[PDB]
């Protein structure tokens, strides 16, 4: 029961990624093919749901993914300039850029205690980092496989990657908040799921249309998935489909509607953000 | 209280590595800079402690390390031809060679259930393998670090590397049988220890002389270490030194005695094997 609360209109390229922290529910973050991130301050509202608070103009190329620390203090960008900048949300100053990859960076991650960085490049190259910008890991999986890479100044540390694969799995992933469950996009909306603990494949889903981003709800037991069709939201138990957030694109072709490309749940699984192929973030709310 | 039981006299280059399986205590395995492994059948004895049972003549270059399955069925070689052969101990037929590395392979490993292979190259490149010869992992650490890479036809699997490092740590490692503890050779016999579970560095040892191989006893609570000085055997609790197996090299210089380069404990921590810089395996026994 998601309802379209409004549209943050900021970027000049696809909103490629959304970020939201449990720290500051006050705040949203977005990357875009405009080489910039934008901090958003959200304010209770009908119109003007959220507001442009700050831009971060560092990368020479597309930012492909962003994410905030657990407190919301620091923002993190992954880019097609193959850089990873770290920013102070409050200032927009980069802290130390990660220089490792030779291929378009494509994801980013931080351990819960905010000391370790898990980059994911386009060539499926993983990399792990000290917050300083020192590269330690450069783990590289076999293309026919997906790879969830967790952790748990230090001179001591411990990592653990998980490896499930399928010849089709098109490198579009995400894991449960408690990282117990993970889903991966094959093609044609085949959404292979998987249970981490149970060490075996729970039953695949079907979006029947090309997928673009997956996003478990922290609160609900829902997966959410972008699509050229629009944003499908599944429940898992029962395994029914909760919604197809399909905007009424005001006079696009039936078939040329801009689509979502990035999802994000409010800190509290009561609000859903989506960047689109029209430089816009649409917002929905689970309503009573 | 180790005593020199005898000398297996087989190879034509350094015995670079020893292998022994819980499966067949009947059996010992050795690699050498002679491009060969040798299965040994051990028979109760004074003279002729062990016997040349079979040679395996595959690699084009030095085998750097060997090891047997837990049952003793299959032998595994890591080589400076950058190959990893898998053999049938009983025949000497290679099964499927691992073709991955570009640098001298230097270690080898199998998960307890004999399905997964953890190669370790000289450039500190790790690699993980299907018993078939398919490469999945190619994890690469930062030279100033050491890396213990564990696991736990499959389309599902899970790995977990641990990373401790030190600018000096000279890439000469081994872990407790129950992989709870690991030691690493710095230079000048600095034997940095570490507790895996306890996530912190227990107190380093000192061999005071260049180290060559480490080897926990399955049975005892001893670490064993090669040296240009000879093979030092520590206990840990108490942290006293149990022995310096220093052969009476019959008329080498004081300072040009051939030294050990590879260690191995009998299945039952009651016998210790050592390959040497003289193409010979010396054997000691903890005696009553």
UniProtKB/Swiss-Prot annotation, chains A, B:
* Biological classification of the source: Eukaryota, Fungi, Dikarya, Ascomycota, Saccharomycotina
Which Gene Ontology biological process is one annotated for this entry? nonfunctional rRNA decay
Question: Which miscellaneous remark does the UniProt record hold?
Answer: Present with 333112 molecules/cell in log phase SD medium.
Task: Enumerate the InterPro entries for this protein.
Answer: G-protein_beta_WD-40_rep, RACK1-like, WD40/YVTN_repeat-like_dom_sf, WD40_repeat_CS, WD40_repeat_dom_sf, WD40_rpt
- PANTHER family recorded: RECEPTOR FOR ACTIVATED PROTEIN KINASE C RACK1 (PTHR19868)
Query: What is the location of the Glycyl lysine isopeptide (Lys-Gly) (interchain with G-Cter in ubiquitin) cross-link?
Result: 41, 48, 102, 132
Q: Please tell me the species this chain comes from.
A: Saccharomyces cerevisiae (strain ATCC 204508 / S288c)
Q: Give a GO molecular function annotation for the protein.
A: translation regulator activity
Similarity section: Belongs to the WD repeat G protein beta family. Ribosomal protein RACK1 subfamily.
Q: Which Pfam families match?
A: WD40
Record PTM Phosphothreonine, positions in chain:
91
For this record, the Gene Ontology CC terms, alphabetical, are: cytoplasm; cytosol; cytosolic small ribosomal subunit; nucleus
What's the domain of life for this entry? Eukaryota
Keywords, comma-separated and alphabetical = Acetylation, Cytoplasm, Isopeptide bond, Phosphoprotein, Repeat, Ribonucleoprotein, Ribosomal protein, Ubl conjugation, WD repeat
Tagged with keyword Ribosomal protein: yes
Free-text disruption phenotype from the record: Defective activation of the ribosome quality control (RQC) pathway.
Function of the protein: Component of the ribosome, a large ribonucleoprotein complex responsible for the synthesis of proteins in the cell. The small ribosomal subunit (SSU) binds messenger RNAs (mRNAs) and translates the encoded message by selecting cognate aminoacyl-transfer RNA (tRNA) molecules. The large subunit (LSU) contains the ribosomal catalytic site termed the peptidyl transferase center (PTC), which catalyzes the formation of peptide bonds, thereby polymerizing the amino acids delivered by tRNAs into a polypeptide chain.
Q: What is this protein called?
A: Small ribosomal subunit protein RACK1
Instruction: Name its cellular compartments.
Output: Cytoplasm
Query: WD repeats at which positions?
Result: 10-50, 58-97, 100-140, 165-204, 206-246, 255-288
Q: How does it assemble?
A: Component of the small ribosomal subunit (SSU). Mature yeast ribosomes consist of a small (40S) and a large (60S) subunit. The 40S small subunit contains 1 molecule of ribosomal RNA (18S rRNA) and 33 different proteins (encoded by 57 genes). The large 60S subunit contains 3 rRNA molecules (25S, 5.8S and 5S rRNA) and 46 different proteins (encoded by 81 genes). RACK1 is located at the head of the SSU in the vicinity of the mRNA exit channel. RACK1 interacts with the mRNA-binding protein SCP16. RACK1 also exists simultaneously as a homodimer in a cytosolic non-ribosome-bound form.
Q: Is ATP-binding found in the keyword set?
A: no
């Amino acid at each position: 029961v998601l309802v379209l609360r409004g549209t943050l209109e900021g970027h000049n390229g696809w909103v490629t990624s959304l970020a939201t922290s449990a720290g500051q529910p006050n705040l949203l973050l977005s990357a875009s093919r405009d080489k910039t991130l934008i901090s958003w301050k959200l304010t209770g509202d009908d119109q003007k749901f959220g507001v442009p608070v700050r831009s971060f103009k560092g990368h020479s190329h597309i930012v492909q993914d962003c994410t905030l620390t657990a407190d919301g203090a620091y923002a993190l960008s992954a880019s097609w300039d193959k850089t990873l900048r770290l920013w102070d949300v409050a200032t927009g100053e980069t802290y130390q850029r990660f220089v490792g990859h030779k291929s378009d960076v494509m994801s980013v991650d931080i351990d819960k205690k905010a000391s370790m960085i898990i980059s994911g490049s386009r060539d499926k190259t993983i990399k792990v980092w000290t917050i300083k910008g020192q590269c330690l890991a450069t783990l590289l999986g076999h293309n026919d496989w997906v790879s969830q890479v967790r952790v748990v100044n230090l001179n001591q540390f411990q990592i653990e990657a998980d490896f499930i694969g399928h010849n089709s799995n098109i490198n579009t992933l995400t894991a449960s908040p408690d990282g117990t469950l993970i889903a991966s996009a094959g093609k044609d909306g085949e959404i292979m799921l998987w249970n981490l603990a149970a060490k075996k494949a729970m039953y695949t889903l079907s979006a029947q249309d090309e997928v673009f981003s997956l996003a478990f709800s922290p609160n609900r037991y829902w997966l959410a998935a972008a699509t050229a069709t629009g944003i499908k939201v599944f429940s898992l138990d029962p395994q029914y489909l909760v919604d197809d957030l399909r905007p009424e694109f005001a006079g696009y072709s039936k078939a040329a509607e801009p689509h979502a490309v990035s999802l994000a749940w409010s800190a509290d699984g009561q609000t859903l953000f989506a960047g689109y192929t029209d430089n816009v973030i649409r917002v929905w709310q689970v309503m009573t």
